[PDB]
Ligand binder design. Structure first.
Ligand SMILES: CCCCCCCC/C=C\CCCCCCCC(=O)O[C@@H](COC(=O)CCCCCCCCCCCCCCC)COP(=O)([O-])OCC[N+](C)(C)C
Ligand SMILES: CCCCCCCC/C=C\CCCCCCCC(=O)O[C@@H](COC(=O)CCCCCCCCCCCCCCC)COP(=O)([O-])OCC[N+](C)(C)C
Ligand SMILES: CCCCCCCC/C=C\CCCCCCCC(=O)O[C@@H](COC(=O)CCCCCCCCCCCCCCC)COP(=O)([O-])OCC[N+](C)(C)C
Ligand SMILES: CCCCCCCC/C=C\CCCCCCCC(=O)O[C@@H](COC(=O)CCCCCCCCCCCCCCC)COP(=O)([O-])OCC[N+](C)(C)C
Ligand SMILES: *[C@@H]1O[C@H](CO)[C@@H](O)[C@H](O)[C@H]1NC(C)=O
Ligand SMILES: *[C@@H]1O[C@H](CO)[C@@H](O)[C@H](O)[C@H]1NC(C)=O
Lengths: 576, 570
């Protein structure tokens, strides 16, 4: 298989549950900012050097495939190079140097030791154990060979601020180099490299247990400190700052991994195909890691665009968790055997539905306890989140009732597709209600009649698909329970909702609470747009290709992880 | 059967992280307000996650319950005796606060932070079922003994200002402890999921539970900065009694009651269980007791000082006690390797701490004072003894001359440290009564460098070296032990005269105790020399006494560093 992809989701659950625990402790009032500063002082001055010293003392230089290492470093250097060049061209002259010195560090440095190491440990203990050392090999060399260029740029900008006009470029570039060398990772890696040759690859027995005890405490405490640093750093941004954060985070999380994969297939001349494919998949997985908090530390000590870099980190850190999941499950998809892709789709939808259901339970509890349900339009939003909770509960039933009885399977399918179709048309009803409220017309909206329609029409569609459709016993996936009749019924329900939302969207342009309501209608249309395309692909192409598999996987993710997006938009808000 | 070889790396982890936390605390790296956040993480997030994971996984079917209520009766018995005399002997205005805080302090060990790594090192590859007993005894001991103490402290709170009102307050504070209610949920979830955590939850509990085993000791080291304070005579005396109770008579009660209540029927397992039961009581006082005294705001100084003292004092007690249990085993010939290994491992920690204390005294320019000058002379000699053991472990099968050279330096250093403690005490007694400069101390230092050299010279001049000796008692045969006895008797008489001159005449606050703590050491050193001459066939009692002679000879620098080094700087 060359990838133990079943046990990736527990690693992302650990790595983001400890981050969530740190965030909860930060926002509550359990640990204030100063005490989180003390925990970070402990982590950054004791835990990371012991971990690095142990993993470089035990590091084996005989089995290291250097080709992957300098291919990944060439990729990171290329990403840094393009981002610095366009940062010099497109930024304003008054602050081109500050952006050119801090943005490529943000878009080139990864959170390897805190987040990357447990995930790679979960994915690469069982079959390919030699890939664990590449984190500790690549991250400090990348730091040492790419960070000084950024600190050089930030120090020219600091020279700009001093406006001395005396040159002596040595005084500045050596200042940047010594600021780089004061990082604990670089000189601690130097000490570990020296002691690897001094001790002859063997940790002393008197110090081994002490270093293991101090190093094993880095992961959880580091994720907890990341969660404690992350309270309240997002704030409200300004025009064009949204676009430059999108461009930087797309660069870091998208074009660096593709460059890593392309340079790995370009620079590796190995004679083994399975080793080459696993190296390419690991190269894709390495670049999707989020930005380390060291960039925000550097901007804080510099007092230099601290808000932009911190906002960039909290968005890339939140955003990479599904990007990691989707990318790794897309990478493990090809070859295999035709039949276990259905089990893979069911397992991925189950792991997504767990997190969406938990976040949806939290957001529903917040919306109910805040007593904001009585005012329009948030009542229909509460109904929508309730319907998505029934979809997720339908997956909880469907994972365990796949092969029990035909009658129970039919009832579970009817309930699950009723909830799915109700969510589908509730998006259109919310959009129509938003369009009616945007008109500022004194029209009494029949919310009770709308709820009766929304609870009856999907049930009628499920009953019609049961009565007229033919059940397919050889289909283990939920999408082919009734065959082509069910997909035709899902297309008609989705097309009517898209037409209703399309009329409301066209009314919004002519007419131009409501600040967020529109985007939840907007973001669902992209979800409904991806559902339509996989149904259109099946009639015109008789042969199910790999693109059909990729489109069905994205249909599953954008259909059943919508509660996560809804929680991210509404639930993480103050006052309520 | 005990893996006693791998105890000393565990004692380096458990006290090196505490030392790392203390240095960062005293320096100014983490101040007091910031240390609270690290404690908040450990006490609210790492410890509850740790407790929940290891009890859902452990099997209740194979737990030897006989050991469980035997260990608990011993802790209950210690609590009972300490509570009884605290009501009789204390002042009437504070009988209830002392009777409620002193016996809780003498019963809760540091099992989750300090006890768990030591038991893990000793009991993984040979007896792996003994590791689950840490997580069983410490919370059960908490629920059935802490409320009994807590009733008395709430009466004292009542005194300044209905039995439900008092006993329910003590009872409801215990279930608010994270240890107590997390153990309740883990026992329930052991039966719900049938000894299996879900795969989606396995990694989350492991990541949060492995971060306790390092961070809690760091916070324990960080909490003790500046907490020792100063105490009066009556508080020093009750503190000695309390630390003696927790670290001495509680472990001996555990061993005796476990051998009485398990009723054998285990062959090799009962003997191994008895040694482990004695080891459980040696663990120091948990830092939760100092936390407990803070929320009560009663007897805060004594309990905090007792906790910061018990963690330090228990560090050699763990090593000596565990190595004494493995002695009645193997054969007499690899017993010599066991004696050599313990002395080498003690001398490592003593030498590193001695280098620090010597550096502090030299750099701070307090050595220019005449009373502190003799301590510096004493402390340099203690550093060279420890370095001599590093040579002797590696020079045993080499040429006779190299063996002789290692032996001459080590025993020269041993007699000089022995007599240098007494001349300084005599010089301090002479300086306290006479204003004359210590001009004979220079002649004494020449003597102290010459008299050991003369003893060293007699062994070089007279050919009586016995090669069949392994460690040290037969280096020159009976001639070396006779020479060591004459040197030891002259040093004890000089120190005895200085102690007697202090009573007849009636900085100096700590100087005396460093002289005092050595006096308990030279009398135990003298008895082992007397034991060898008055006995032809070496018995088993001679083996235990010879080991104790080795520890106070080669780790004597550790006691000196703890008294003098951690005072101040300039
Ligand atoms: C191809 C896409 C690449 C590049 C096109 C990028 C276009 C949008 C960025 C500029 C936004 C803007 O209006 O900035 C304004 C202010 O804004 C600032 O001062 C902050 C932004 C400056 C730093 C931008 C870093 C870009 C990172 C790159 C990451 C690459 C990611 C690649 C992968 C996707 C200034 O803009 P202006 O008024 O036009 O400037 C006046 C000067 N001029 C008239 C001479 C031009
Ligand atoms: C099984 C695997 C699936 C996992 C799903 C994936 C992850 C789960 C996703 C979403 C689920 C949880 C979302 C929480 C979002 C923020 C919560 C929060 O910070 O509020 C409270 C957290 O303190 C608490 O009250 C703890 C209980 C609520 C949060 C945890 C549930 C704090 O209140 P606040 O108003 O935010 O803070 C303001 C300060 N104030 C307290 C003084 C007001
Ligand atoms: C042999 C040593 C063992 C036992 C003898 C104990 C006697 C010494 C302790 C009292 C000190 C003292 O001077 O007390 C003074 C104040 O007392 C205090 O300041 C508080 C003392 C209470 C705590 C005692 C803890 C003992 C733990 C023990 C754990 C042991 C575990 C086993 C291991 C050995 C007053 O004392 P008093 O004037 O005498 O009291 C007046 C009442 N009377 C006149 C009626 C007497
Ligand atoms: C094979 C392995 C064997 C290992 C052996 C294990 C056993 C080792 C055991 C004990 C030996 C060490 C004990 C020292 C503890 C005290 C340190 C301390 O806080 O002192 C000083 C720091 O000092 C340092 O920074 C210490 C540097 C490292 C020393 C240890 C190595 C602080 O000095 P101060 O005057 O308190 O500072 C005043 C505050 N001010 C700076 C704001 C003004
Ligand atoms: C990768 O290494 C070599 C390729 O030269 C070959 O044995 C095989 O393709 C792989 N081996 C292992 C052990 O993964
Ligand atoms: C411990 O268990 C039983 C106790 O009766 C016995 O086999 C022996 O003493 C020990 N056995 C093992 C395998 O440790």
């Amino acid at each position: 298989p060359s990838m133990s992809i079943t046990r990736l989701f527990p690693a992302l659950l650990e790595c983001f549950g400890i981050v969530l625990c740190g965030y909860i402790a930060g926002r509550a009032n359990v640990i204030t900012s100063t005490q989180a500063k003390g925990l970070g002082n402990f982590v950054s001055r004791f835990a990371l050097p012991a971990l690095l010293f142990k993993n470089m003392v035990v590091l084996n230089f005989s089995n290291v495939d250097w080709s992957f290492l300098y291919s990944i470093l060439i990729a990171k250097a290329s990403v840094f190079f393009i981002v610095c060049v366009l940062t010099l061209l497109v930024a304003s002259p008054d602050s081109r140097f500050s952006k050119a010195g801090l943005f490529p560090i943000f878009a080139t440095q990864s959170n390897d030791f805190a987040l990357g190491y447990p995930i790679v440990e979960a994915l690469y203990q069982t079959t390919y154990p030699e890939y664990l050392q590449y984190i500790y090999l690549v991250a400090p060399i990348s730091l040492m060979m790419l960070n000084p260029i950024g600190f050089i740029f930030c120090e020219i900008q600091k020279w700009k601020d001093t406006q001395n006009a005396s040159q002596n470029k040595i005084k500045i570039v050596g200042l940047g180099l010594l600021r780089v060398l004061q990082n604990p990772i670089v000189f601690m890696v130097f000490i570990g490299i020296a002691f690897n040759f001094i001790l002859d690859r063997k940790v002393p027995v008197y110090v081994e247990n002490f270093l293991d005890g101090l190093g094993n405490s880095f992961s959880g405490s580091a994720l907890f400190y990341l969660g404690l640093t992350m309270v309240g750093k997002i704030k409200r941004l300004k025009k064009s700052a949204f676009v430059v954060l999108i461009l930087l985070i797309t660069a870091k999380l998208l074009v660096l991994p593709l460059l890593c994969r392309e340079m790995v297939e370009l620079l590796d001349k190995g004679d083994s195909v399975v080793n080459h494919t696993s190296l390419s998949n690991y190269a894709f997985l390495y670049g999707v890691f989020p930005v380390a908090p060291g960039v925000a530390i550097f901007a804080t000590q510099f007092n230099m665009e601290v808000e932009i870099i911190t906002s960039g980190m909290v968005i890339s850190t939140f955003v990479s968790a599904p990007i990691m999941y989707v990318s790794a499950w897309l990478l493990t998809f090809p070859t295999m055997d035709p039949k276990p892709l259905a089990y893979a789709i069911q397992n991925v939808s189950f792991d997504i539905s767990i997190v969406s259901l938990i976040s949806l339970i939290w957001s529903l509890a917040i919306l109910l306890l805040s007593k904001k349900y009585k005012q329009l339009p948030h009542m229909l939003t509460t109904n929508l989140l309730i319907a998505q909770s029934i979809v997720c509960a339908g997956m909880m039933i469907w994972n365990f009732v796949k092969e029990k009885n035909f009658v129970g399977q039919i009832l579970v399918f009817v309930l699950l597709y009723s909830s799915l179709y109700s969510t589908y048309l509730w998006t259109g009803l919310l959009a129509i209600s938003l369009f009616l409220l945007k008109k500022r017309e004194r029209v009494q909206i029949p919310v009770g009649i709308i709820i009766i329609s929304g609870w009856g029409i999907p049930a009628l569609l499920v009953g019609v698909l049961l009565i007229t459709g033919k059940h397919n016993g050889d289909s283990i996936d939920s999408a082919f329970f009734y065959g082509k009749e069910q997909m035709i019924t899902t297309a008609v329900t989705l097309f009517c909702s898209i037409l209703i939302a399309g009329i409301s969207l066209m009314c919004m342009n002519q007419t131009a609470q409501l600040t967020r309501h529109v985007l939840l209608c907007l973001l669902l249309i992209i979800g409904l747009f991806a559902n339509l395309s996989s149904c259109l692909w099946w009639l015109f192409n008789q042969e199910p290709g790999r693109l059909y598999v990729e489109l069905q996987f994205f249909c599953a993710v954008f259909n059943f992880g919508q509660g996560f997006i809804s929680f991210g938009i509404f639930g993480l808000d103050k006052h309520l």
